[PDB]
Amino acid sequence: PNMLRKRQMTVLDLHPGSGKTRKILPQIIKDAIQQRLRTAVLAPTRVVAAEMAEALRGLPVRYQTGNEIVDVMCHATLTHRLMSPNVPNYNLFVMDEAHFTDPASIAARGYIATKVELGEAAAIFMTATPPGTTDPFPDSNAPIHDLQDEIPDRAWSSGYEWITEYAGKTVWFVASVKMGNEIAMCLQRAGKKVIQLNRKSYDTEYPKCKNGDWDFVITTDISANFGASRVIDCRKSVKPTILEEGEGRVILGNPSPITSASAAQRRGRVGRNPNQVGDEYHYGGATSEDDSNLAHWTEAKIMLDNIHMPNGLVAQLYGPEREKAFTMDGEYRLRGEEKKNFLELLRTADLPVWLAYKVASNGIQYTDRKWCFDGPRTNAILEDNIEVEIVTRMGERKILKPRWLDARVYADHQALKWFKDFAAGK
């Protein structure tokens, strides 16, 4: 209850499997309402806000993704609102999964930390792996066998007997959906039942695990729980990376080492049941915290620079994250029409922050799509081995050749489809 008073930043380092959302969160919220604190409760991802709504039943809470003083929203709803000209004076912020390195999450932590430092609010960040984490092997409810193994990143014809011999359930984190599919098909040829949880997520696949009739779930990301007694972790992921070369570019790099926080979260899927001994975590490479060129640090700073504060001052990243990229505070601030264009490119067109910033900072209007087509011929986007063409709503056929390339807009067929609609003026 005391943690709720202004000027306190509390990190609840709760090791994986402690049920923070389900037990600890409701008590905090009950104490907040009791103390009449205007409270923002922040969820990172799709499911967590909903899991919060059930956890917080009976409590006067308002969900935003009449008289309630507690608001539940995604990390990103807060950040997008903060940048706009349209946010309550929260006395308390509670951020669940406060390790997420989505740019809007990083920016949200910076804003919150800044408000707490000013003595304007209190905050509680809940996560097993808080920012500044370096330990991939945190505590668990049951001991876990940590095993360094060579992990395949493609189909195998022989060897790797330990993978297929195992009798229990395995979650295998792979570096890419493509790689995941090769592996899944491999395992299926070996008689294993496999679920690929990527963006067939809440299709059949998400609650296809609850039936329990599977041997492996192959996934790239986010670490709801399953029946797993074993995790296989390639310990790599493909990350958007900024290349400062030309007029600048964002690439999706070859698979690179994950952070210790990510490794800990992956490992933390197992060892959760104090009556189940022998769970295993097999990992295939080192972690790294050297990731200053990840797009998200710069994108977080772009967002923070664009949140106006009262003291004329610029919010800063949360302390342990400040070192991830040093710029002069305010460097990325946009004003007037450029800022309006930037927000529209973010909220309507859903462009990545970096790309929205490049377009708006070059004085381009939201509705002017010429930049999608007037880049150098080296920038032509190719899909299934041919130049991508669109027909604009004006009746012109154009090759998609953007002035700035952000690989996230052509990462998958669906990303490229959305970007083509955008380029055409749909």
CA distance 247 to 400: 17
Indicate if 150 and 88 belong to the same structural domain.
no
What 8-state DSSP symbol labels residue 321? Answer: G
Judged by phi (left if over 0) then psi (alpha if -120 to 50, else beta), residue 25 lies in: alpha
Indicate if 309 and 398 belong to the same structural domain.
no
CA distance 410 to 419: 7
Per the structure, the count of domains in the chain is 3
Indicate if 119 and 214 belong to the same structural domain.
no
Encode 137-187 in three state secondary structure: CCCCCCCEEEEECCCCCCCCCCCCHHHHHCCCCEEEECCCHHHHHHHHHHH
Three-state secondary-structure class, residue 132: coil
Inter-residue contact 136 to 302 (CB < 8 Å): no
Indicate if 307 and 377 belong to the same structural domain.
no
Three-state secondary-structure class, residue 227: coil
Indicate if 299 and 371 belong to the same structural domain.
no
- The helix-helix angle for 336-347 and 75-83 (nearest 10°) equals 160
Task: Provide the domain limits for residue 115.
Answer: 1-133+291-328
Structure tokens at 30: 């009950």
Structure tokens at 422: 């955008």
Q: What is the resolution of this structure in A?
A: 1.8
If you search the block for the tokens 């910076």, which residue do you land on?
110
Tell me whether strands 236-237 and 230-233 are parallel, antiparallel or unpaired: unpaired
CA distance 265 to 285: 16
Inter-residue contact 352 to 295 (CB < 8 Å): yes
CA distance 284 to 352: 31
> DSSP characters for 10-71?
EEE---TTS-IIIIIHHHHHHHHHHTT--EEEEE-SHHHHHHHHHHTTTS-EEE-----SEE
How far is residue 53 from each of residues 88, 116, 150, 341, 417, measured CA to CA in Å?
Answer: 20, 26, 41, 34, 33
- CB burial string 365-376: b at 16+ within 10 A, e below: ebeebebbbebe
Among 273, 307, 328, where does a domain finish? 328
Indicate if 46 and 9 belong to the same structural domain.
yes
Indicate if 200 and 334 belong to the same structural domain.
no
**Which residues on neighbouring strands pair with residue 24, listed in sequence order?**
none
CA distance 122 to 1: 12
CA distance 239 to 234: 14
User: What CATH number corresponds to the domain at position 260?
Assistant: 3.40.50.300
Inter-residue contact 91 to 122 (CB < 8 Å): yes
Indicate if 220 and 282 belong to the same structural domain.
yes
Indicate if 113 and 28 belong to the same structural domain.
yes
Please indicate the experimental technique that yielded this structure.
X-ray
How far is residue 156 from each of residues 85, 152, 160, 181, 239, measured CA to CA in Å?
Answer: 55, 7, 8, 13, 25
Indicate if 318 and 178 belong to the same structural domain.
no
> Which residue, among 41, 120, 40, 52, has the nearest Cα to 88 in the 3D structure?
40
